[PDB]
Short mmCIF file of C-alpha atoms and ligand atoms in Angstrom, two decimals:
data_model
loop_
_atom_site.label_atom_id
_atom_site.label_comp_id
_atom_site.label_asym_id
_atom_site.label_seq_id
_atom_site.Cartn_x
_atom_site.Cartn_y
_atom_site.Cartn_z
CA UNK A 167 -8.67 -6.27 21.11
CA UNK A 168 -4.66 -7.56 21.31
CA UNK A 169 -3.42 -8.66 18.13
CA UNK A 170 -0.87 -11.42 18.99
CA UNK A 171 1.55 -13.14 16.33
CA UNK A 172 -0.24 -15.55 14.39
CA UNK A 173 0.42 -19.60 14.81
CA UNK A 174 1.25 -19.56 10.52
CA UNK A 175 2.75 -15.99 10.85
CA UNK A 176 6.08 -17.41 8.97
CA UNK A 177 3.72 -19.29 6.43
CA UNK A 178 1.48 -17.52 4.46
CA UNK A 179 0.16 -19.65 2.25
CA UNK A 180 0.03 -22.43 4.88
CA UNK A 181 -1.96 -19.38 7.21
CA UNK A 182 -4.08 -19.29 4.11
CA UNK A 183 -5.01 -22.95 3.42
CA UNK A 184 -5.63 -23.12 7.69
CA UNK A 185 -7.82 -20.34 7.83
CA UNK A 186 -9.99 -21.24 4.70
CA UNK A 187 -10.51 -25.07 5.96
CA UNK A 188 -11.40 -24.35 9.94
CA UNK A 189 -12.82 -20.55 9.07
CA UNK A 190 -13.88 -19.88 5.42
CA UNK A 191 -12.09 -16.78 5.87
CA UNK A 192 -11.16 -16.27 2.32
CA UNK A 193 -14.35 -17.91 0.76
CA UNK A 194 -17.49 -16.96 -0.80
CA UNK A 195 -20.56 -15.36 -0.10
CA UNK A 196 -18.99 -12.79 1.96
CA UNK A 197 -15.17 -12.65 0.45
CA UNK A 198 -15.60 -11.90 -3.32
CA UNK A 199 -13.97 -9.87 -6.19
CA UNK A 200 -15.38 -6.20 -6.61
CA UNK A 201 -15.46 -5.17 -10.27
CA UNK A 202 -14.64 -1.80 -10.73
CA UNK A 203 -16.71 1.28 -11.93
CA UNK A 204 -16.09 3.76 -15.01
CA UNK A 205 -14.86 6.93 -14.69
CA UNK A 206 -17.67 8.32 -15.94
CA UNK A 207 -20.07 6.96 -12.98
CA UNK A 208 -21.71 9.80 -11.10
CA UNK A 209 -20.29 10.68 -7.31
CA UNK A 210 -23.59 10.88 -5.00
CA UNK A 211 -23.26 13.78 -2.84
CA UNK A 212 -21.48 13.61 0.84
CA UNK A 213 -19.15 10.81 -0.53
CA UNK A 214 -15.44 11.21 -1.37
CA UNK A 215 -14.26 10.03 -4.70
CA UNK A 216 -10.36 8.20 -3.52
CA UNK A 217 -8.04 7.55 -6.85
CA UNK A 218 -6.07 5.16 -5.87
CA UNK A 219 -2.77 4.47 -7.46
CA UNK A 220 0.24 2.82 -6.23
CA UNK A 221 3.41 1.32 -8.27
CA UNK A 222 3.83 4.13 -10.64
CA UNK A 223 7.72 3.18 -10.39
CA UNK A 224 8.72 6.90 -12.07
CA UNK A 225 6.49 5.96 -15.25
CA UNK A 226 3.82 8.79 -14.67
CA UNK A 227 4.10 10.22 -17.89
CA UNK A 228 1.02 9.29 -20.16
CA UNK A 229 -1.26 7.67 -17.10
CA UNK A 230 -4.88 8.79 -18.19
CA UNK A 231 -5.76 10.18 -14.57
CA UNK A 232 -10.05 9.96 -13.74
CA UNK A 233 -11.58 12.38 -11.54
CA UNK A 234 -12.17 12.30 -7.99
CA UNK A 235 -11.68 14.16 -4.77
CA UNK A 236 -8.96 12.47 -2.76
CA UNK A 237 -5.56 10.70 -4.40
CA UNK A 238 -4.05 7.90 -2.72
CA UNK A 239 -0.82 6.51 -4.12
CA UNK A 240 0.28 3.40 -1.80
CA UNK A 241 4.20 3.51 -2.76
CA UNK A 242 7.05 2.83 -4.85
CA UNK A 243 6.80 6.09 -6.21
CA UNK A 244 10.43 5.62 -7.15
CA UNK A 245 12.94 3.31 -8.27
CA UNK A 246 15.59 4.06 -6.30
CA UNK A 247 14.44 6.81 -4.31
CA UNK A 248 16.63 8.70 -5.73
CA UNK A 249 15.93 12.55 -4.57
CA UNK A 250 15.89 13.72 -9.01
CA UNK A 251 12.69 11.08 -9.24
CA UNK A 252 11.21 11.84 -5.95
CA UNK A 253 11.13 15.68 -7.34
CA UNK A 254 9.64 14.27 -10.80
CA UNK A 255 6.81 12.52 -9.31
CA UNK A 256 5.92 15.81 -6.97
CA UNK A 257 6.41 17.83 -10.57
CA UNK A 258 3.49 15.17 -11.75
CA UNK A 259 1.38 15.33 -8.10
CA UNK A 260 1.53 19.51 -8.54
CA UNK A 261 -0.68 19.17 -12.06
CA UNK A 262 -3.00 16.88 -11.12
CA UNK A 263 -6.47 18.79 -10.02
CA UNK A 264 -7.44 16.59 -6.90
CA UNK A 265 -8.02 18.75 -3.11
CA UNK A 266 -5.88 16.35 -1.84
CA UNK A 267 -3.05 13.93 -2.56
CA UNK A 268 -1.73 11.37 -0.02
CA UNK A 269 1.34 9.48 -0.18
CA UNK A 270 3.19 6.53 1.65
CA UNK A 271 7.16 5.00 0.78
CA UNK A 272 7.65 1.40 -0.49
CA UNK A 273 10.21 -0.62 -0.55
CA UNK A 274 12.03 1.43 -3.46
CA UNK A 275 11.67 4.16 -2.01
CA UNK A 276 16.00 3.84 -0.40
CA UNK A 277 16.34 7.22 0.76
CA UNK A 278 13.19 7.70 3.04
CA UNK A 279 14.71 4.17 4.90
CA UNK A 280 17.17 5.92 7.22
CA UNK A 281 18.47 2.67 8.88
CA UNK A 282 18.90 1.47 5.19
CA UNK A 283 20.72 4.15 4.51
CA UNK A 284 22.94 4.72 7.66
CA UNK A 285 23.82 0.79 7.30
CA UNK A 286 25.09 1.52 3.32
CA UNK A 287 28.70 0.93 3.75
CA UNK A 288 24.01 -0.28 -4.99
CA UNK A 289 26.27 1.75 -7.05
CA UNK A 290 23.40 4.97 -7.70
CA UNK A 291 22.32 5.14 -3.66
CA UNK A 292 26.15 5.24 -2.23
CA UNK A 293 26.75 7.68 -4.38
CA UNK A 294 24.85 10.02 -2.14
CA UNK A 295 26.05 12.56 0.39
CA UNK A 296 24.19 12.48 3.31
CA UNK A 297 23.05 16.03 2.43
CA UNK A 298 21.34 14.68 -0.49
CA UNK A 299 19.01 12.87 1.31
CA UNK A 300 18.35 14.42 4.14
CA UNK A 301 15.34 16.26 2.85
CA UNK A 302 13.98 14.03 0.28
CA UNK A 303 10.00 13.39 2.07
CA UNK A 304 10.25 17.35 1.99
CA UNK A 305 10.69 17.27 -1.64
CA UNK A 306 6.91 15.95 -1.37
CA UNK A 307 5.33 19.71 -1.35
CA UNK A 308 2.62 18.34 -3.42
CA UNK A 309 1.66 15.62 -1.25
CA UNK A 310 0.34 14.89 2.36
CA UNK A 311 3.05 12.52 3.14
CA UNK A 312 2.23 9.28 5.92
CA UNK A 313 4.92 7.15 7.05
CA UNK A 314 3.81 5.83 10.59
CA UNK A 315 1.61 8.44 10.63
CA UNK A 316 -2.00 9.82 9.96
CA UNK A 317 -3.80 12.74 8.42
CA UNK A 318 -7.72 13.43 8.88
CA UNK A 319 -9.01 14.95 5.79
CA UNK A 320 -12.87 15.80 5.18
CA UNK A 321 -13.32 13.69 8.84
CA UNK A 322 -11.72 10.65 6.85
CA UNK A 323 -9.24 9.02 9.37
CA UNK A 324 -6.16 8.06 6.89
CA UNK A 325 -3.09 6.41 8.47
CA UNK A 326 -0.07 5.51 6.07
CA UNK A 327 2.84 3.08 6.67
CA UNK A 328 5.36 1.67 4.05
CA UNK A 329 6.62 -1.43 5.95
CA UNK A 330 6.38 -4.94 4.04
CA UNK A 331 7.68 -8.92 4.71
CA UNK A 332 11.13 -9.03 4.37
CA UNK A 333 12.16 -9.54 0.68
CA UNK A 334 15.63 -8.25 -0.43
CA UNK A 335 16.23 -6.30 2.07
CA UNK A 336 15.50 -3.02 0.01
CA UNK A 337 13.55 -0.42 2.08
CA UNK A 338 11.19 -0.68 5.47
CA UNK A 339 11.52 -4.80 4.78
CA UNK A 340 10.81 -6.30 8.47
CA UNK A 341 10.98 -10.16 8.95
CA UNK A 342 7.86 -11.70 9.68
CA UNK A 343 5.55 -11.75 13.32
CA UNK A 344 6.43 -9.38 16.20
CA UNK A 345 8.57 -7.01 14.06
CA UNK A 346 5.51 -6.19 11.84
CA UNK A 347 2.91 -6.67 14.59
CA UNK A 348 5.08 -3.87 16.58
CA UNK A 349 4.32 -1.72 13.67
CA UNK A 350 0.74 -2.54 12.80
CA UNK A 351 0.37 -1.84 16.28
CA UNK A 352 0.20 1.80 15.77
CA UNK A 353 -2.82 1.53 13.69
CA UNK A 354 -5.15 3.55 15.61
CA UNK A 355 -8.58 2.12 16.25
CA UNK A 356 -10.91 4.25 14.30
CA UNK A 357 -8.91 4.50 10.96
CA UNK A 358 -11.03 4.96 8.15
CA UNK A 359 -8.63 4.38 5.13
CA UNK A 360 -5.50 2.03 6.09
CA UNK A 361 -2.56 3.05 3.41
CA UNK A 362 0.05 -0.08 3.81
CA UNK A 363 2.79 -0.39 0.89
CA UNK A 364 2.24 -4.14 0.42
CA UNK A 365 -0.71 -6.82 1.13
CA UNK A 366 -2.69 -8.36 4.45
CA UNK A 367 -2.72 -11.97 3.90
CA UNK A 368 -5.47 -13.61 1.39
CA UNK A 369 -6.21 -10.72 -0.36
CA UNK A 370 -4.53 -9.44 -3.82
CA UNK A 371 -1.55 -11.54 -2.51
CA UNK A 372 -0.82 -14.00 -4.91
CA UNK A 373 3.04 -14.33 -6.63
CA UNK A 374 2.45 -16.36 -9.53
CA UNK A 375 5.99 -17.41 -10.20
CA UNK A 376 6.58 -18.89 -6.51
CA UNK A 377 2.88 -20.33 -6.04
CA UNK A 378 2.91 -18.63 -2.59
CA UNK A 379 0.69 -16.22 -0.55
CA UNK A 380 3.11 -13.32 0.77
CA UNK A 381 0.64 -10.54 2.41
CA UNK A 382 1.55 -9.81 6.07
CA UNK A 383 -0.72 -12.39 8.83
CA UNK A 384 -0.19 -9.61 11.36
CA UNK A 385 -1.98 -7.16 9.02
CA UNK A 386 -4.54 -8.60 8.02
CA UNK A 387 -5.28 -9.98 11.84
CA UNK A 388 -4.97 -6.15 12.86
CA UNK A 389 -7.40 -4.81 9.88
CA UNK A 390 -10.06 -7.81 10.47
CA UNK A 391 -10.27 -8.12 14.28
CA UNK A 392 -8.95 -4.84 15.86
CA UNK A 393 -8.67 -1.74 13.07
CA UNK A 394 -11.65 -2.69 10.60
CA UNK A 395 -11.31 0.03 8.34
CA UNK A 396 -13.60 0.61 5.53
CA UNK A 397 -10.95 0.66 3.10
CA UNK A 398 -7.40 -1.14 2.99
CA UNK A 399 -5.07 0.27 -0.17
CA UNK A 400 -2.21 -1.20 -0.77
CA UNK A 401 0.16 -2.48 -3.57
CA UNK A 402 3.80 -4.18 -3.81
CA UNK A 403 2.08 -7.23 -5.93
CA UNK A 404 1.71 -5.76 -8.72
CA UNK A 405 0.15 -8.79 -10.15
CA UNK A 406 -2.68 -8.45 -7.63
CA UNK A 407 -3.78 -5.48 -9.20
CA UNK A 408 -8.01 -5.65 -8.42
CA UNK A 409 -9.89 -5.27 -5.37
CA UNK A 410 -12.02 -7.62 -3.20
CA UNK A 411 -13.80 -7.20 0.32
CA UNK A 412 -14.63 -9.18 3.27
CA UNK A 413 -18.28 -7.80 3.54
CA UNK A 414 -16.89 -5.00 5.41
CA UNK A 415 -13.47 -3.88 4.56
CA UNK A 416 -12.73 -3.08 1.39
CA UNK A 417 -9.43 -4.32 -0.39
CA UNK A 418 -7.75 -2.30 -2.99
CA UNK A 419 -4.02 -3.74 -4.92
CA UNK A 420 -4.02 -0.24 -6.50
CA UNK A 421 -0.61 -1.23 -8.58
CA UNK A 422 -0.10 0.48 -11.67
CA UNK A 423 2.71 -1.01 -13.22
CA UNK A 424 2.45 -4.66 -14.00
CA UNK A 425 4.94 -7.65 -12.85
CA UNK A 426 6.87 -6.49 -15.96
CA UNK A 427 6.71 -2.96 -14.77
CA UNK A 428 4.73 -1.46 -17.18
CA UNK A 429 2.10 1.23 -16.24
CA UNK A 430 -0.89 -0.08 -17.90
CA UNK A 431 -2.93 -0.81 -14.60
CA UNK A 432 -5.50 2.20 -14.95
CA UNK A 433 -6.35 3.75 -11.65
CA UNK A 434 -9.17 2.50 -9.43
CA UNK A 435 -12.10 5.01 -8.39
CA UNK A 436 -14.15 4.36 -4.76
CA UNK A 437 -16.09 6.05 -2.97
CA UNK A 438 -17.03 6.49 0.71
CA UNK A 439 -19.63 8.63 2.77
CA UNK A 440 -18.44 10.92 4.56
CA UNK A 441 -17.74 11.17 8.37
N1 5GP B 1823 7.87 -14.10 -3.84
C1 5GP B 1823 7.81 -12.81 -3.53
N2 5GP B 1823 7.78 -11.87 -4.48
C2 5GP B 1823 7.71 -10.57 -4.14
C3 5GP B 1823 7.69 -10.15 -2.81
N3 5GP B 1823 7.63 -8.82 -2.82
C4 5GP B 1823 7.62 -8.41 -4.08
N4 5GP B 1823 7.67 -9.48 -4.89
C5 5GP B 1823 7.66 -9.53 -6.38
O1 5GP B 1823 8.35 -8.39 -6.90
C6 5GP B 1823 7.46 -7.65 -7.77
C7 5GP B 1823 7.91 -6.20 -7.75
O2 5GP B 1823 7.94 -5.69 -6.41
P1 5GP B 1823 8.75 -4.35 -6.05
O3 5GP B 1823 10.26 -4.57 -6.41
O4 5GP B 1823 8.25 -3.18 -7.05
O5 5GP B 1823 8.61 -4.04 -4.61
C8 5GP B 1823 6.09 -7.93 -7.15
O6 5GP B 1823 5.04 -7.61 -8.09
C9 5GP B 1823 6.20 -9.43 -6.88
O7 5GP B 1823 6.10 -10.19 -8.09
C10 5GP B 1823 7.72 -11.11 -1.80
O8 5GP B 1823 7.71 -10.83 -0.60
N5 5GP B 1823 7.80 -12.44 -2.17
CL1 CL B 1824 -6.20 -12.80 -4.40
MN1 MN B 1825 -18.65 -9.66 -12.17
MN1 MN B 1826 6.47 -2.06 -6.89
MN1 MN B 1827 -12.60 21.44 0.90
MN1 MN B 1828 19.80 18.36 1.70
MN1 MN B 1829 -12.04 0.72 13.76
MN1 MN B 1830 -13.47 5.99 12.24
MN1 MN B 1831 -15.20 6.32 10.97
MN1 MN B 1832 7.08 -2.84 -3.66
#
């Protein structure tokens, strides 16, 4: 399968409306809300247990953490990136039980964006000596960090990447079509779990205060027709917080903090089988 750049591509909510009149591609029976499970529900054996978190925006102190197997934390980690709260949220990653903990960048996340940062000449970031920054994903000891990149963990094929819809211009923002497509792309076919920072179009995409869609058309083209993962966890909207699925994939907004950037969101448990 070739992904190609959608007809709507610059449009979102105009893909949206297209694709639910000629396609039903966002309808009911098979597109639907999943309600979520207590922490308390029992993990049948041969399944991983994912915690998925995203969002946390350096406000990690007092989240009420479930348990499970695997973490996933989808980005923005950070507010600034700056290397004392990258170091923070590995001090909070190091005391948390799970085997594993994986971790992608979002958009706040300055100092992982190396063209961001060569291009800086945001009174905190310039501040920075390029020897600052030059190891910040190390400072991730705690972590398995992705960032174009995969990891296979209990035969789970994980691939991470923190690129989003051009915004603000704050970190890994691409415009819209081919410069996105070029790096959904390098989704490999048989990914299990797709980490992305931000949304695929239709699902857990909605900005309240603009009245717009503003998930990616080239991601969720790739997940749907080429990739179909079993799992797609993402954040950015923090208002999207919830999950849905398709009938295959599943769709997880894992954000923590609310619109108003307050960590109330409480983490969402899933499980898979095993490979
Ligand atoms: N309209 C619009 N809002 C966005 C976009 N990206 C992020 N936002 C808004 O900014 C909030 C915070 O995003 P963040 O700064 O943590 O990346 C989101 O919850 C959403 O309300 C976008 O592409 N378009
Ligand atoms: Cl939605
Ligand atoms: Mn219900
Ligand atoms: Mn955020
Ligand atoms: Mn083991
Ligand atoms: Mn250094
Ligand atoms: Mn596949
Ligand atoms: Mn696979
Ligand atoms: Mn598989
Ligand atoms: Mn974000």
């Amino acid at each position: 399968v070739t992904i190609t750049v959608d007809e709507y591509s610059s449009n979102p909510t105009q893909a949206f409306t297209h694709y639910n009149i000629n396609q039903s591609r966002f309808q009911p029976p098979h597109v639907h809300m999943v309600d979520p499970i207590p922490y308390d529900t029992p993990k049948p054996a041969g399944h991983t247990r994912f915690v998925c978190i995203s969002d946390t925006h350096s406000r990690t102190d007092g989240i009420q953490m479930p348990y499970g197997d695997i973490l996933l934390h989808t980005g923005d980690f950070t507010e600034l990136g700056l290397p004392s709260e990258v170091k923070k949220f590995n001090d909070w990653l190091g005391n948390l039980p799970y085997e594993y903990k994986i971790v992608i960048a979002g958009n706040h996340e300055l100092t992982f964006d190396k063209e961001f940062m060569a291009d800086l000449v945001f009174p905190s970031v310039s501040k920075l000596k390029p020897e600052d920054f030059d190891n910040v994903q190390s400072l991730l000891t705690n972590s398995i960090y992705l960032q174009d990149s995969e990891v296979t963990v209990k035969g789970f094929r994980i691939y991470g990447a923190p690129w989003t819809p051009w915004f603000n211009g704050w970190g890994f923002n691409l415009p819209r079509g081919q410069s996105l497509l070029d790096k959904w792309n390098l989704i490999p076919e048989g990914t299990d779990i797709l980490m992305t920072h931000g949304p695929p179009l239709g699902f857990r995409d909605w900005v309240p205060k603009e009245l717009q869609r503003v998930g990616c058309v080239e991601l969720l083209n790739t997940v749907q027709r080429r990739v179909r993962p079993k799992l797609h966890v993402f954040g950015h909207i923090h208002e999207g917080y919830g999950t849905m699925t398709d009938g295959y994939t599943t769709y997880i907004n894992a954000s923590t903090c609310t619109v108003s950037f307050q960590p109330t969101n409480p983490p969402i448990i899933f499980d898979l089988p095993n490979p």
